Amino acid sequence: CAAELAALEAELAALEGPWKGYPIPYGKLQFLIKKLKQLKVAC
């Protein structure tokens, strides 16, 4: 939970990379949804 939470935090914070103001590809949203679901099942 804690480390998976910290991981998702750091991924969301960094999510733009250098692409400031750019939309987040659907694939990345699905990856986040999967990570958040795996984080719910963890915890």
Binding site: G17, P18, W19
Partner: protein, 95 residues
């Protein structure tokens, strides 16, 4: 702050991108109506193949249905379903 070469190359390369497409480009034989909105957001192949002999073309397609307002002289606005072609996968292919 500088976008590294590797990142520019990955994000520019031929792939489906949200594209604002004029409905008349999809329904060129519509004579009766004008549309609101006039454009729709569609996923369409775009970006570059970095070879003037290559072009970015769809290899997988699907449809999306949207409610569009259809406006005609001397009558009320209609709202009706219209279907548009989506690109799901793209490849750089010889012209």
């Amino acid at each position: 702050e500088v976008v590294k070469f590797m990142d520019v190359y990955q994000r520019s390369y031929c792939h489906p991108i949200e594209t604002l497409v004029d409905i008349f480009q999809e329904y060129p034989d519509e004579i009766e109506y004008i549309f609101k909105p006039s454009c729709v957001p569609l996923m369409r192949c775009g970006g570059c193949c970095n070879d003037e002999g290559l072009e970015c073309v769809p290899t997988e397609e699907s449809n999306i249905t949207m409610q569009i307002m259809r406006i005609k002289p001397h009558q009320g606005q209609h709202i009706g379903e219209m279907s548009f072609l989506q690109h799901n996968k793209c490849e750089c292919r010889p012209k």
